[PDB]
Design an enzyme around this catalytic site. Structure first.
Site, PDB file in Angstrom:
ATOM      1  N   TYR A 191       0.865  -1.169   0.000  1.00  0.00           N
ATOM      2  CA  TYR A 191       0.000   0.000   0.000  1.00  0.00           C
ATOM      3  C   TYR A 191       0.911   1.231   0.000  1.00  0.00           C
ATOM      4  O   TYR A 191       1.040   1.928  -1.022  1.00  0.00           O
ATOM      5  CB  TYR A 191      -0.965  -0.013   1.179  1.00  0.00           C
ATOM      6  CG  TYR A 191      -1.959   1.126   1.159  1.00  0.00           C
ATOM      7  CD1 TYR A 191      -3.012   1.155   0.233  1.00  0.00           C
ATOM      8  CD2 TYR A 191      -1.850   2.169   2.059  1.00  0.00           C
ATOM      9  CE1 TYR A 191      -3.926   2.197   0.225  1.00  0.00           C
ATOM     10  CE2 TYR A 191      -2.765   3.220   2.066  1.00  0.00           C
ATOM     11  CZ  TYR A 191      -3.795   3.227   1.156  1.00  0.00           C
ATOM     12  OH  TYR A 191      -4.697   4.269   1.199  1.00  0.00           O
ATOM     13  N   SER A 231      -5.290   1.132  -5.160  1.00  0.00           N
ATOM     14  CA  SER A 231      -5.306   2.606  -4.915  1.00  0.00           C
ATOM     15  C   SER A 231      -3.882   3.166  -4.772  1.00  0.00           C
ATOM     16  O   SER A 231      -3.128   3.141  -5.744  1.00  0.00           O
ATOM     17  CB  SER A 231      -6.199   2.979  -3.720  1.00  0.00           C
ATOM     18  OG  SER A 231      -6.512   4.370  -3.764  1.00  0.00           O
ATOM     19  N   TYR A 232      -3.481   3.640  -3.586  1.00  0.00           N
ATOM     20  CA  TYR A 232      -2.068   4.042  -3.402  1.00  0.00           C
ATOM     21  C   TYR A 232      -1.160   2.845  -3.702  1.00  0.00           C
ATOM     22  O   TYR A 232      -0.073   3.005  -4.273  1.00  0.00           O
ATOM     23  CB  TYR A 232      -1.766   4.596  -1.981  1.00  0.00           C
ATOM     24  CG  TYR A 232      -0.561   5.533  -1.962  1.00  0.00           C
ATOM     25  CD1 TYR A 232       0.749   5.037  -2.065  1.00  0.00           C
ATOM     26  CD2 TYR A 232      -0.737   6.916  -1.881  1.00  0.00           C
ATOM     27  CE1 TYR A 232       1.855   5.903  -2.080  1.00  0.00           C
ATOM     28  CE2 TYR A 232       0.356   7.790  -1.886  1.00  0.00           C
ATOM     29  CZ  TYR A 232       1.642   7.278  -1.996  1.00  0.00           C
ATOM     30  OH  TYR A 232       2.717   8.138  -2.013  1.00  0.00           O
ATOM     31  N   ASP A 267     -15.687   4.366 -10.518  1.00  0.00           N
ATOM     32  CA  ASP A 267     -14.864   4.780  -9.378  1.00  0.00           C
ATOM     33  C   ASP A 267     -14.906   6.309  -9.254  1.00  0.00           C
ATOM     34  O   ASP A 267     -14.347   7.029 -10.085  1.00  0.00           O
ATOM     35  CB  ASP A 267     -13.432   4.267  -9.586  1.00  0.00           C
ATOM     36  CG  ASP A 267     -12.585   4.342  -8.334  1.00  0.00           C
ATOM     37  OD1 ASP A 267     -12.810   5.248  -7.512  1.00  0.00           O
ATOM     38  OD2 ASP A 267     -11.691   3.479  -8.170  1.00  0.00           O
ATOM     39  N   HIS A 303     -14.761   2.254  -6.263  1.00  0.00           N
ATOM     40  CA  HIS A 303     -13.410   2.057  -5.807  1.00  0.00           C
ATOM     41  C   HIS A 303     -13.213   0.735  -5.085  1.00  0.00           C
ATOM     42  O   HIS A 303     -12.113   0.159  -5.116  1.00  0.00           O
ATOM     43  CB  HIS A 303     -12.982   3.211  -4.896  1.00  0.00           C
ATOM     44  CG  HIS A 303     -11.518   3.241  -4.637  1.00  0.00           C
ATOM     45  ND1 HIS A 303     -10.587   3.365  -5.648  1.00  0.00           N
ATOM     46  CD2 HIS A 303     -10.814   3.141  -3.483  1.00  0.00           C
ATOM     47  CE1 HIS A 303      -9.374   3.340  -5.126  1.00  0.00           C
ATOM     48  NE2 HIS A 303      -9.483   3.213  -3.814  1.00  0.00           N
TER      49      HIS A 303
HETATM   50  C1  LIG Z   1      -6.284   5.060  -2.541  1.00  0.00           C
HETATM   51  N1  LIG Z   1      -5.430   4.670  -1.681  1.00  0.00           N
HETATM   52  C2  LIG Z   1      -6.593   6.492  -2.910  1.00  0.00           C
HETATM   53  C3  LIG Z   1      -5.624   7.183  -3.860  1.00  0.00           C
HETATM   54  C4  LIG Z   1      -4.559   7.772  -2.939  1.00  0.00           C
HETATM   55  C5  LIG Z   1      -5.318   8.135  -1.657  1.00  0.00           C
HETATM   56  N2  LIG Z   1      -6.566   7.389  -1.746  1.00  0.00           N
HETATM   57  C6  LIG Z   1      -7.632   7.559  -0.887  1.00  0.00           C
HETATM   58  O1  LIG Z   1      -8.688   6.927  -0.985  1.00  0.00           O
HETATM   59  C7  LIG Z   1      -7.407   8.610   0.200  1.00  0.00           C
HETATM   60  N3  LIG Z   1      -8.554   8.672   1.168  1.00  0.00           N
HETATM   61  C8  LIG Z   1      -8.380   7.820   2.398  1.00  0.00           C
HETATM   62  C9  LIG Z   1      -7.374   8.513   3.323  1.00  0.00           C
HETATM   63  C10 LIG Z   1      -7.237   7.713   4.640  1.00  0.00           C
HETATM   64  C11 LIG Z   1      -6.723   6.315   4.249  1.00  0.00           C
HETATM   65  C12 LIG Z   1      -7.736   5.584   3.342  1.00  0.00           C
HETATM   66  C13 LIG Z   1      -9.108   5.477   4.028  1.00  0.00           C
HETATM   67  C14 LIG Z   1      -9.611   6.885   4.381  1.00  0.00           C
HETATM   68  O2  LIG Z   1     -10.889   6.779   4.991  1.00  0.00           O
HETATM   69  C15 LIG Z   1      -8.606   7.576   5.324  1.00  0.00           C
HETATM   70  C16 LIG Z   1      -9.748   7.723   3.108  1.00  0.00           C
HETATM   71  C17 LIG Z   1      -7.931   6.393   2.040  1.00  0.00           C
END
Ligand SMILES: *C(=N)[C@@H]1CCCN1C(=O)CN[C@@]12C[C@@H]3C[C@@H](C[C@@](O)(C3)C1)C2
Ligand SMILES: *[C@@H]1O[C@H](CO)[C@@H](O[C@@H]2O[C@H](CO)[C@@H](O)[C@H](O)[C@H]2NC(C)=O)[C@H](O)[C@H]1NC(C)=O
Ligand SMILES: *[C@@H]1O[C@H](CO)[C@@H](O[C@@H]2O[C@H](CO)[C@@H](O)[C@H](O)[C@H]2NC(C)=O)[C@H](O)[C@H]1NC(C)=O
Ligand SMILES: *[C@@H]1O[C@H](CO)[C@@H](O[C@@H]2O[C@H](CO)[C@@H](O)[C@H](O)[C@H]2NC(C)=O)[C@H](O)[C@H]1NC(C)=O
Ligand SMILES: *[C@@H]1O[C@H](CO)[C@@H](O[C@@H]2O[C@H](CO)[C@@H](O)[C@H](O)[C@H]2NC(C)=O)[C@H](O)[C@H]1NC(C)=O
Ligand SMILES: *[C@@H]1O[C@H](CO)[C@@H](O[C@@H]2O[C@H](CO)[C@@H](O)[C@H](O)[C@H]2NC(C)=O)[C@H](O)[C@H]1NC(C)=O
Ligand SMILES: *[C@@H]1O[C@H](CO)[C@@H](O[C@@H]2O[C@H](CO)[C@@H](O)[C@H](O)[C@H]2NC(C)=O)[C@H](O)[C@H]1NC(C)=O
Ligand SMILES: *[C@@H]1O[C@H](CO)[C@@H](O[C@@H]2O[C@H](CO)[C@@H](O)[C@H](O)[C@H]2NC(C)=O)[C@H](O)[C@H]1NC(C)=O
Ligand SMILES: N=C[C@@H]1CCCN1C(=O)CN[C@@]12C[C@@H]3C[C@@H](C[C@@](O)(C3)C1)C2
Ligand SMILES: *[C@@H]1O[C@H](CO)[C@@H](O)[C@H](O)[C@H]1NC(C)=O
Ligand SMILES: *[C@@H]1O[C@H](CO)[C@@H](O)[C@H](O)[C@H]1NC(C)=O
Ligand SMILES: *[C@@H]1O[C@H](CO)[C@@H](O)[C@H](O)[C@H]1NC(C)=O
Ligand SMILES: *[C@@H]1O[C@H](CO)[C@@H](O)[C@H](O)[C@H]1NC(C)=O
Ligand SMILES: *[C@@H]1O[C@H](CO)[C@@H](O)[C@H](O)[C@H]1NC(C)=O
Ligand code: NA
Lengths: 728, 728
Positions: free
Chosen positions: A509, A592-593, A670, A702
């Site tokens: 991640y 995602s990330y 998404d 998503h």
């Molecule tokens: C997926 N990881 C995408 C693209 C980069 C950031 N992202 C998110 O969805 C960011 N939103 C959050 C930030 C933190 C960690 C994750 C859950 C969340 O509820 C808190 C929302 C992603």
């Protein structure tokens, strides 16, 4: 030979973790659902009675999604016609059931398509949002009072968040806050007039002849952001005046100078509210503490009570400034803040003194403040055994900070290293929830003496089932890089033999403040890969990761797609050096990330990875939302950080994908990481003549989380990994 | 050993067919572009002069896309800044060069973003369309006269077609028709006010932060259609002081009673125009013949001059009613219509008599009428050797219909079985273009005694190149289904050995009036698959196919997705029983209608096919455009043909995909077969838990035709077929 944990096991949920989800209704009673009956339990003795029989709503005519009992126990709010929106938001129909008359309320019903509903914290007042305006009902069967008249679809949001505030600021759809005894209702108003729209097709059921275009106000990095206002209305005046005034509390001058956010709202007393504001450049935040002025009817925030929180090395807070926890009299509060060494610890403030006193310290972090009484503060931290991936409950004596007791550390140290907690209304009891490394264990405790009352759920049923399965093991450890410990975990195949070479999948991640190496017990895709396919599934927390101090967390400040990517590559190299990994069969995947980091790694030309899978990846930071992206990246302008925004795209690495097998997957609906992001990756790959595998998921968001899509994606990914690793 | 024809050869066009594209400018001369110089050739002797030197526009400052010389040879229209729209439409900038005074015209220029431009057929007047309105220039250096003032983007189209008329009615963007000597300009006007919009995302270059939504007025089956009006303007009486008067010619009463189309416009004389109109239920068409009334300035269409064309077995015409070919005086005409046996033949009509006389007959069809003189009509047919997939030029003596002479049949029977033709202005000369089964051959002929004057291009260069390549062969033959012969072709690997078993790919289109078994020489993906991969590539013309009479063509009337699908399965079943086909390795693929049929076949449960590939498939007829879909299917209403629309979808067959390997491919910006169609297929397969392979092409349209996408799709499909057939 015992069976293994198979893909069908994971997808069909054959081995189920049992939970114990209780809802505290008082200082000594909780509600719990058993065989669809709602039971009320006495915490002290463990005896129960039926609160609401499971036959009550047989003739309701709708399947009930959820319920909410009013704090005074007089009414139940029934949620049905549940239609999901984003991560937290949804709409529903609502009926109120009178528990004393044992009768459904049929007059002055909550309207259909209601966006949010909440009881007051005491009694049975309701606040709800419908067509983007706030309404208040003093009694469930009486007419509502309209609070706002400005609500406008996609434009003005009263008492609910817009897309970016829901996802990245509040982690909630709701933007209203009742005062402790319900006299005041505070709320935010968001104005998205000039915020650009993301537009994408939604195909719907096959009966739909023309696809719909979904349009959502969504500020991408550097775009026009929503603006925000904050108001407080006196709900006790509603039945006495034709149109009660919402009193605005304005942001401080230090915020009004430019773009900013409202980032926290916390009531301190019946007549004192705290607000935290954050600059669009998110290294500067200000808390105002505002008191109701009975003579003027206004809310005033003394500058002597204003608190500044800033960062010289990064942004403020883990994802946002932390919430204060006020003492009963509201004259002081506790708050997690980064100390001089960069470790997050509890600081104690007087409301009108600018210097605070740290009450915890050390090379570990406080995760959260859980409860505050006149004598003790209870918090969760990763102090125990210096393991950043463990969690325990501690109790600190407010009259003597040297007296700190670990409440959970030694309860079952082999089975339980990761705890969360749920306290009763005035902290007389607490439920401990152990989530690993053994099977989850739920226990109840009395605060007066910290004695264990009883085991609520020990998952003995699952334990019995798992005895007949060749389950993988989990290893949690660290490697040392540049004299810094970095933690990793491995899901290891059953009967793991260190003299053999296993294929390895790096599960990534790696977002800022992320933690993928921990002591939590999980039954997931990795369980199957290790158990059935004999694949080691590894995860690594490198630079940028959380809960280990700011030196590590802020290492990627203004530089996403650099050290956190490099550290995953280096982790894979170090895993090779350990001797039990087939270096010809290393893969990487993430969502995602994790999809971004997977793609950056595969495009790095490192030669370390054979193949990888990116699901819903970010590909270019300018495509992602403003609040999250700018927190770490600043603004995409030549005067700020445009050069790095432009240097950190997946697309620029297209040529290097000639060296790997890539599977790219994205849901077409998404709303978060737009399909656009993968559409640009694929186009860049086509443009350099790189062959790869692709899969879109029609109308999935998503989460790609519909029952059928979830099964399909993991099945498709399993084939891809197995092919890559030459597994039959 | 010599090389094979490789995938790279196909993708990089290593082996190029030479053409001989000429433009007749009189009865005796043609223009031909040679080394970027335009030459004029004398047809009688073959001598040439330079008409326009390549270096004339060295300093032009724009890359010239195309040129158009005025009919009198005085001017040249230079096309640049070409921007493609749909299949035929585009915009461009234009400059006019005076060939006499050797200078660019700088006065009163044709505007940028011009949608259509055309010279009058005689002289050098110009008509052009800009911002959906028509303009006329009498002299290239003089101000334009604005003809229409109502043009509005996506709403009112004057002199150009909307999406559905462009694609399915006129096969052209232009909706302008000059009278023979240029006195009158006839035009259609389309009104799309109530036509629904298809909407889809366009991602653009990586730099675009937010995707764009493309919106196109596009009537899907049963939706509101564009309406049409028809006008004629006299261009000899235009005024600088007064707005031009357009005279409307209204549709006949039998058309005005309901929805209808304008389907043909053909000038007969200087003062007589014919129009054909088609009902929205496309089995009824009417031709009006309209004469200019010089005393009133009106156009009158006498009811005694109306000609009805209808079908009891299907729709009218192959894809639309055929065009009339009028005699010099315009008092009679020749027109291809279906005879009482269902075979398309030439009928001779008098403008004021109901009954026509067929001048050709037999169990074969006239493909097109090519030229007409007082003594002969020249036409192309598939009469020769009873081969429906061959084409030859014939002439018929108008004074004795028993005297029909084949003009191309015996020229080179081994090399040339498929001809087209281009006649000079008054049919004094003709160019024959042979396109197979040998290399294309271009020859010039004189009509008076049908002398073969000279060989223009014989592709002897390519022949020399191909001598050192192991090229595949093509077998054209027939099978018998139910007493009827149906034709197929096989592209056979080099050194074909009937004692070996080869895998087989069925290349399908199978749309109504389609023909995939013919004598044309092609260098394409199939050439590579046969030459390099030793795969037989077969195609079959079953029920619904063209050029073999209405019994075959109308077999699928109101029933798409039935017999044409079944017949592909039956052909493969028969091929699979041939000694040289490996029944364990039969695949199927196709594009558009071929993607639909492939998908319907793969979902049939036949068990004959191991795998297949659908590219831009139709999946449900309600998603496809009105004009094409309703021609074959009628309306999707309970009272008409809804039941069959509903049971002819790919989605309903999803469960049957469990035993096949399927690759589904679609361009995201396909304005024709919307990505929606594949999005619904994938969702249906996900819903039944069937695994499959997918690929989207970002921003590609129906052609998936950009250099990089073209190479990528054929590369991806090649890997898929080879994997399916266990080929290294
Ligand atoms: C997926 N990881 C995408 C693209 C980069 C950031 N992202 C998110 O969805 C960011 N939103 C959050 C930030 C933190 C960690 C994750 C859950 C969340 O509820 C808190 C929302 C992603
Ligand atoms: C659990 O048990 C307690 C005590 O045994 C119950 O509390 C009350 O006990 C009195 C005895 O003095 C009884 O008369 C009542 O039946 C109880 N009160 C009420 C309001 O019911 C208690 O009710 C039990 N709790 C639950 C949830 O069943
Ligand atoms: C939301 O913000 C918009 C501006 O983005 C406000 O709209 C402006 O309102 C004033 C009237 O006071 C007009 O003069 C402007 O034309 C408006 N600007 C735009 C861009 O529309 C709007 O009033 C705000 N709404 C609320 C409820 O605060
Ligand atoms: C209740 O009071 C609010 C606040 O004064 C009123 O909202 C205003 O309405 C007028 C016109 O209807 C607008 O000109 C103002 O811009 C509004 N202000 C705000 C802050 O919303 C509201 O209309 C009143 N409701 C009733 C029933 O009188
Ligand atoms: C909840 O708290 C509010 C705010 O302090 C109380 O309202 C005040 O009550 C006092 C009486 O003690 C009055 O002097 C004030 O005029 C009230 N202020 C306002 C703004 O209404 C309220 O009484 C409390 N509610 C309950 C049920 O205790
Ligand atoms: C077509 O477009 C070009 C470019 O806009 C026009 O060329 C002129 O020259 C420059 C740039 O090449 C522009 O700044 C001018 O505004 C243009 N105008 C003129 C009057 O020369 C060109 O004029 C356009 N052609 C027509 C027929 O409108
Ligand atoms: C093209 O054909 C038109 C129509 O037949 C000719 O126009 C007519 O010409 C005669 C003069 O010889 C006039 O008496 C008529 O009134 C004209 N009719 C109209 C409608 O204009 C025209 O002369 C021909 N043009 C050329 C260049 O041959
Ligand atoms: C054109 O095709 C249609 C549809 O096949 C024919 O429609 C007939 O008339 C009505 C339409 O509502 C139906 O109830 C009948 O069943 C249709 N007749 C049939 C199928 O024989 C129409 O007759 C056709 N026109 C011509 C000239 O053949
Ligand atoms: N086959 C693909 C898709 C879906 C089904 C029909 N279709 C068309 O493009 C129809 N439009 C035409 C396609 C072919 C044959 C006719 C003329 C043509 O120019 C070329 C457009 C109909
Ligand atoms: C909600 O919708 C249903 C069905 O349309 C309707 O019967 C009911 O009256 C609605 N309820 C309210 C409170 O408006
Ligand atoms: C906030 O960040 C910007 C950009 O890095 C910087 O210029 C500014 O000094 C920072 N503020 C603080 C208090 O560190
Ligand atoms: C061809 O030849 C004739 C006679 O020799 C000549 O006068 C004529 O101009 C030539 N035509 C061309 C197009 O060069
Ligand atoms: C186009 O059609 C609409 C009805 O759909 C009508 O109101 C309008 O006037 C028409 N416009 C023109 C220019 O004919
Ligand atoms: C021609 O028609 C247009 C549009 O109706 C009008 O604006 C213009 O004034 C007219 N010109 C003359 C000369 O009547
Ligand atoms: Na000759």
């Amino acid at each position: 030979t015992r069976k293994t944990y198979t893909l069908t096991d994971y997808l069909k949920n054959t081995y189920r973790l049992k939970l114990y989800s209780l809802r505290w209704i008082s200082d000594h009673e909780y509600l719990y659902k058993q065989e669809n009956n709602i039971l009320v339990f006495n915490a002290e003795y463990g005896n129960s009675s039926v609160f609401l029989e499971n036959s009550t709503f047989d003739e309701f005519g709708h399947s009930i999604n959820d319920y909410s009992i009013s704090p005074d126990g007089q009414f139940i709010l029934l949620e049905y016609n549940y239609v999901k929106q984003w991560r937290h938001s949804y709409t529903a129909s609502y009926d109120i059931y009178d528990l004393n008359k044992r009768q459904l309320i049929t007059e002055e019903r909550i309207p259909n398509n209601t966006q949010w509903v909440t009881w007051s914290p005491v009694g049975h007042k309701l606040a709800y949002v419908w067509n983007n305006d706030i309404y208040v009902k003093i009694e469930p069967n009486l007419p509502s009072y309209r609070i706002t008249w400005t609500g406008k679809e996609d434009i003005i949001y009263n008492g609910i968040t817009d897309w970016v505030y829901e996802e990245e600021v509040f982690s909630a759809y709701s933007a209203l806050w009742w005062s402790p005894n319900g006299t005041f209702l505070a709320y935010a108003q968001f104005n998205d007039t000039e915020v650009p729209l993301i537009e994408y097709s939604f195909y719907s059921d096959e009966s739909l002849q023309y696809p719909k275009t979904v349009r959502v106000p969504y500020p991408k990095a550097g775009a026009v952001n929503p603006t925000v206002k904050f108001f407080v209305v006196n709900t006790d005046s509603l039945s006495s005046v034709t149109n009660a005034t919402s009193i605005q509390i304005t942001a401080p001058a230090s915020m009004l100078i430019g773009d900013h956010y409202l980032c926290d709202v916390t009531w301190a007393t019946q007549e004192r509210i705290s607000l935290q504001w954050l600059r669009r450049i998110q290294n500067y935040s200000v808390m105002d503490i505002c008191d109701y002025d009975e003579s003027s009817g206004r809310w005033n925030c003394l500058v002597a009570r204003q608190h500044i929180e800033m960062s010289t090395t990064g942004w403020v807070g883990r994802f946002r400034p932390s919430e204060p926890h006020f003492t009963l009299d509201g004259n002081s509060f506790y708050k997690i803040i980064s100390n001089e060494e960069g470790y997050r610890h509890i600081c104690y403030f007087q409301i009108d003194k600018k210097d605070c006193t740290f009450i915890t310290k050390g090379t570990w972090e406080v995760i959260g403040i859980e409860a505050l009484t006149s004598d003790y503060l209870y918090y969760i931290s990763n102090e125990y055994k210096g393991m950043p991936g463990g969690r325990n409950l501690y109790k600190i004596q407010l009259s003597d900070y040297t007296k700190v007791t670990c409440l959970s550390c030694e309860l079952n140290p082999e089975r339980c290293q990761y705890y969360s907690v749920s306290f009763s209304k005035e902290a007389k009891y607490y439920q401990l929830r152990c989530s690993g490394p053994g099977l989850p264990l739920y226990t109840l405790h009395s605060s007066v003496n910290d004695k264990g009352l009883r085991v609520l759920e020990d998952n003995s049923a699952l334990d019995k089932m798992l005895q007949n399965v060749q389950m993988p093991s989990k290893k949690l450890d660290f490697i040392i890089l540049n004299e810094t410990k970095f933690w990793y975990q491995m899901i290891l195949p059953p009967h793991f033999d260190k003299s053999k070479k296993y294929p390895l999948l790096l599960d990534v991640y790696a977002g800022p403040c992320s933690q993928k190496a921990d002591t939590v017990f999980r039954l997931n895709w990795a369980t199957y890969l290790a158990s059935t396919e004999n694949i080691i599934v590894a995860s690594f927390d490198g630079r940028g990761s959380g809960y280990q101090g700011d030196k590590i967390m802020h290492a990627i400040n203004r530089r996403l797609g650099t050290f956190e990517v490099e550290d995953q590559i280096e982790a894979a190299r170090q895993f090779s050096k350990m001797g039990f990994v087939d270096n010809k069969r290393i893969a990487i995947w993430g969502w995602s990330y994790g999809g971004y980091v997977t793609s950056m790694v595969l495009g790095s030309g490192s030669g370390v990875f054979k193949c990888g899978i990116a699901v819903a990846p970010v590909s270019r930071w300018e495509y992602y939302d403003s609040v999250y992206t700018e927190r770490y990246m600043g603004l995409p302008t030549p005067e700020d950080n445009l050069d790095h925004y432009r240097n950190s795209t997946v697309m620029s690495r297209a040529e290097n994908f000639k060296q790997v097998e890539y599977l790219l997957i994205h849901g077409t609906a998404d709303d978060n990481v737009h399909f656009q992001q993968s559409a640009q990756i694929s186009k860049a790959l086509v443009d350099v003549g790189v062959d790869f595998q692709a899969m879109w998921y029609t109308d999935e968001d998503h989460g790609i989380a519909s029952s059928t899509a979830h099964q399909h994606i993991y099945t498709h990914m399993s084939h891809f990994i197995k092919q890559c690793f030459s597994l039959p």
